[PDB]
């Protein structure tokens, strides 16, 4: 049946008109399976015979799932018709739900065809029904209700299911549902009699609406299978994650593996895919067949072992603390839990190496730090208590004195090494008592051919000459040099408008395997004084 | 009352800016705010054909149980046609004026049919386990730039009275602000505003003491090598701004490969030169001229241990006034909340002199800013901003500035 619900109006785009792609042609026995189905329909109320009038036509067509089904094409009607409110994209997390005695979910498929279509709009909708070959006019319809497939289906079916649920969700606030696609997830903390009993007073209510029940058989029960997890009573899972077994990958198959154990990592601690990643070197097709080598192996066995490990989480609880651990898993990875009580976690996850320009540990913790807070806000609407592996007097030395505005809520130290610090600190002041390099570097920019080199006050001296450089490498090598041929205290004089970043912000990772070279050098000095002077 | 076709600028079409994800205390709280705006009639649910979004938040300014409702129209104000405000020059030249927010005026005028739709606005919902709450305006919003506007001539109207009551007082609207500027004593200043107060219920600002603070070289009694390698370097840099700064003699004492721990003796044409370069800052570059046409830009450097330097200006190096912000007490961890405060400071400051607010350059990163900024926001009102990355220099020179 139809819901008595009104029509949202729609419209097509700015000025557009309806589509008017052409009827594909089928075979007699196609169109008399379509006229079957369009006769059921059109008693229904679905959709109405038509007439001269429309110009407009969508085609039809006819697939077999193992008795005959419409298919109506609205790829032209769709990207012609309005936009519409996001049908809500944004994807929940189990570690958000509330954990709830009983949940039940109700089906509403064929719900699209419940709700009817703004009359206004209803033209564009127009299809055709084809006459065996060519010969005479084939039967023309129209759509009276949502159209599966078209555009706005999703948007106004699940506007009109919220109205619909309005004075439900205010009789009985201890209830939640959750509408999802043509599902409708029930919970609540009543008794198991009464639960069943609301819903189905809900279902009952519904039903009022021209929104149909389904059956015992197309009813689903737990654990619920959506959106790739398993959830139960108590906790949710994740579920099997499965990897081919295989005598031969091509390039597109370690791709694809790559690709789903990369996905992996995040709920799994030790996924690693560098030998497998490796096979795509020089690779020269899709299908090409690249040897495991025993690396690769080796790990796709380590990989194998570890999926088969049970990884759950468990559900929200409003009224216990939402904690948050950090762990600097390597240089620009890291890996974070958030749980309430102790081992039993909420959600995991881990933050990749991005290889880029310069940055240091305490900023990507900062970094990761934000990731994190932004997340739980979106899924608890709080953000956590932070316990993280550096020292607030690490913390206090370093924020205070950077030239950005960063922040970390409120935190706490645990120390489970590795613990995040600063691998180095430039002196305030010039060391006295320790070398003064004069370091300069040139190189002509066209024939990448320059010199590198230094004059301290001790009277020592360098010259290397560089080929195939470029100016900011002969500079940078400049103080290369300085860093490697001076003791374990340097003052170094630079007209490098680069080096001036680096007292500004004193990197401890970078891009550039020069800029990581003396970075290296600069960690190991005890004290090393940076001063920049005009060009 | 009848409603004024309003319009977005020719070629503009609504604005759909994407919902932050917002706190579920606040959350509850614009909820509970929303339900009695749409009782009272003030704004109503709407469908899913309308595409359009702005952004909304809640804040707390003066009180503390309450909760306030701030809605970001800086999109749709952009594309919302012309029409305005007369900014009177007298205001920075009182020595009090105080700010009163006159939001609620504008819920008594109704809101052009065809237009409401641009309005629309999303309370979000935890998890997404809820579609957002859709809402479009039926009156003028506060914080849109067509309110004001419209609601022109019912305030003049308004203030008119007072206004001709006491024409020794000046009175500036800029969105849902009011600016009231007075010379009388600090008592009678603030008695004389409740007069104003209970005049609209029926329906701590010093610009004078803004000072220009100029930039102030090093003295020393002994001068190192690294010394005048850092004066010289500042000066250099500052000579972008005073051309008729020099380095010269200053430059010839680094000839050599000296410790940089080594004492220096100037040379009186070095002495001379830094004599030169000292008068040249003691007063701003002349020929900066404020630029309507054109848009006001606000810089802030992080200078670090709370403290905070900004420039205002139109063009590089043609500062319009620059200054500094020393954080205020308790936001002593809080790098964000500093930083806010202070952008709420330089965009008050620059209301109150041209009438507008500049765009500022803000040393944060994207992501670190709008994470956490709504937290200490207390304006009703928002100015436009970048982040960038702070030049070396530009904060040496700055750190300068006289105390
Ligand atoms: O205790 C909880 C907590 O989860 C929920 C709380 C409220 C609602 Cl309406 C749905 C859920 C879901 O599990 C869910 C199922 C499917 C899709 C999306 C969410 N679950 C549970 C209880 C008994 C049995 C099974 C699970």
């Excluded at chain 1, 619900?5 to 557009?16: C, D, N, Q, S």
């Excluded at chain 1, 959830?231 to 579920?239: A, E, N, R, S």
């Amino acid at each position: 049946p139809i819901s008595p619900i009104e029509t949202v109006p729609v419209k097509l785009k700015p000025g557009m008109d309806g589509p008017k792609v052409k009827q594909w042609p089928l075979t007699e026995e196609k169109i008399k399976a379509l006229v079957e189905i369009c006769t059921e329909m059109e008693k229904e109320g679905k959709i109405s015979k038509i007439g001269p009038e429309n110009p407009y036509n969508t085609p039809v067509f006819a697939i077999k799932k193992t008795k005959w089904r419409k298919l109506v094409d609205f790829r032209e009607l769709n990207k012609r018709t309005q936009d519409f409110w996001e049908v809500q994209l944004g994807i929940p997390h189990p570690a958000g739900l509330k954990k709830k005695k009983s949940v039940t979910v109700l089906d509403v498929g064929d719900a699209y065809f419940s709700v009817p279509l703004d009359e206004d709009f209803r033209k564009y909708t127009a299809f055709t029904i084809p006459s065996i070959n060519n010969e005479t006019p084939g039967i023309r319809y129209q759509y009276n209700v949502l159209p599966q497939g078209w555009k706005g289906s999703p948007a106004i079916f699940q506007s009109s299911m919220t109205k619909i649920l309005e004075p439900f969700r205010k009789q009985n606030p201890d209830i939640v549902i959750y509408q999802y696609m043509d599902d409708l997830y029930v919970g609540s903390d009543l008794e198991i009699g009464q639960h069943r009993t609301k819903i189905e007073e809900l279902r009952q209510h519904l039903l009022r609406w021209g929104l149909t029940t389904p059956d015992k058989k197309h009813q689903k029960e737990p654990p619920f299978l959506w959106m790739g997890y398993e959830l139960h009573p108590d906790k949710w899972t994740v579920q099997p994650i499965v990897l081919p077994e295989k005598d031969s990958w091509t390039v597109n198959d370690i791709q694809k593996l790559v690709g789903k154990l990369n996905w992996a990592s995040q709920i799994y601690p030790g996924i690693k895919v560098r030998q497998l990643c490796k096979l795509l070197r020089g690779t020269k097709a899709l299908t090409e067949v690249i040897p495991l080598t025993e690396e690769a192996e080796l790990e796709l066995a380590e990989n194998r072992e570890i999926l088969k490990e049970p990884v759950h989480g468990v559900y929200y609880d409003p009224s216990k603390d939402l904690i948050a651990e950090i762990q600097k898993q390597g240089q620009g990875q890291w890996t974070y839990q958030i749980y309430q009580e102790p081992f039993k976690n909420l959600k995991t996850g881990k933050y990749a190496r991005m290889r880029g320009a310069h940055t240091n540990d305490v900023k990507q913790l900062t970094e990761a730090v934000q990731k994190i807070t932004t997340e739980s806000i979106v899924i608890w609407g709080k953000t956590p208590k932070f316990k993280l592996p550096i020292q607030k007097e690490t913390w206090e030395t370093w924020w205070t004195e950077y030239w950005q505005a960063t922040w970390i809520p409120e935190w706490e130290f645990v120390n489970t090494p590795p613990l995040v610090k600063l691998w180095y600190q430039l002196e305030k002041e010039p060391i006295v008592g320790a070398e003064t390099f004069y370091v300069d570097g040139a190189a002509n920019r066209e024939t990448k051919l320059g010199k590198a080199g230094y004059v301290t006050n001790r009277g020592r001296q360098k010259v290397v000459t560089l080929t195939d450089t470029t100016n900011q490498k002969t500079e940078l090598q400049a103080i290369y040099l300085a860093l490697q041929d001076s003791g374990l205290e340097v003052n170094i004089v630079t007209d490098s408008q680069y080096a001036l970043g680096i007292i500004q912000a004193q990197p401890d990772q970078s891009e550039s395997e020069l800029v990581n070279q003396i970075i290296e050098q600069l960690i190991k000095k005890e004290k090393v004084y940076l001063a920049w002077v005009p060009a | 009352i009848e409603t004024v076709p309003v319009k977005l600028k020719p070629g503009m079409d609504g604005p759909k800016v994407k919902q932050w994800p917002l706190t579920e205390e606040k959350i509850k709280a614009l909820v509970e705010i929303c339900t009695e705006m749409e009782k009272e009639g003030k704004i109503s649910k709407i469908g899913p054909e309308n595409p359009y979004n702005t952004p909304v938040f809640a804040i707390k300014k003066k009180d503390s149980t309450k909760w306030r409702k701030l809605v970001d129209f800086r999109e749709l104000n952009k594309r919302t046609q012309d029409f305005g405000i007369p900014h009177p020059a007298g205001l920075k030249k009182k020595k009090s004026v105080t700010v009163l927010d006159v939001g609620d005026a504008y819920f008594s005028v109704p809101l052009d049919e065809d237009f409401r739709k641009y309005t629309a606005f999303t309370i979000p919902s935890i998890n997404n386990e809820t579609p957002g709450i859709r809402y479009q305006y039926n009156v003028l919003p506060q914080g849109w730039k067509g309110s004001p506007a419209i609601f022109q001539s019912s305030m003049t109207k308004i203030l008119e009275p007072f206004r001709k009551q006491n024409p020794d007082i000046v009175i500036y609207q800029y969105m849902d602000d009011l600016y009231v500027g007075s010379d009388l004593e600090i008592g009678q200043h603030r008695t004389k505003i409740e007069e104003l107060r209970q005049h609209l219920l029926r329906w701590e600002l010093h610009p004078d003491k803004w000072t220009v603070q100029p930039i102030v070289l090093p003295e020393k009694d002994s001068w190192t090598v690294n010394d005048i390698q850092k004066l010289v370097g500042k000066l250099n840099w500052a000579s972008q701004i005073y051309p008729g700064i020099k380095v010269r003699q200053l430059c010839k004492l680094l000839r050599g490969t000296k410790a940089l721990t080594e004492v220096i003796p100037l040379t009186e044409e070095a002495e001379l030169e830094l004599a030169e370069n000292r008068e040249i800052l003691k007063e701003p570059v002349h020929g900066v001229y404020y630029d309507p046409s054109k848009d006001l830009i606000a810089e802030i450097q992080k200078q670090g241990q709370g403290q905070w330097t900004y420039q205002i200006y139109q063009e590089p190096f043609k500062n319009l006034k620059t200054g500094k912000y020393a954080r205020m007490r308790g936001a002593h961890t809080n790098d964000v909340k500093q930083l806010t405060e202070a952008v709420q400071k330089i965009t008050t400051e620059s209301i109150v002199i041209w009438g507008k607010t500049p765009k500022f350059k803000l040393p944060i990163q994207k992501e670190t800013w709008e994470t956490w900024w709504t937290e200490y926001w207390q304006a009703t009102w928002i100015p436009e901003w970048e982040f960038v990355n702070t030049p070396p220099l530009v904060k040496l020179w700055y750190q300068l500035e006289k105390e």
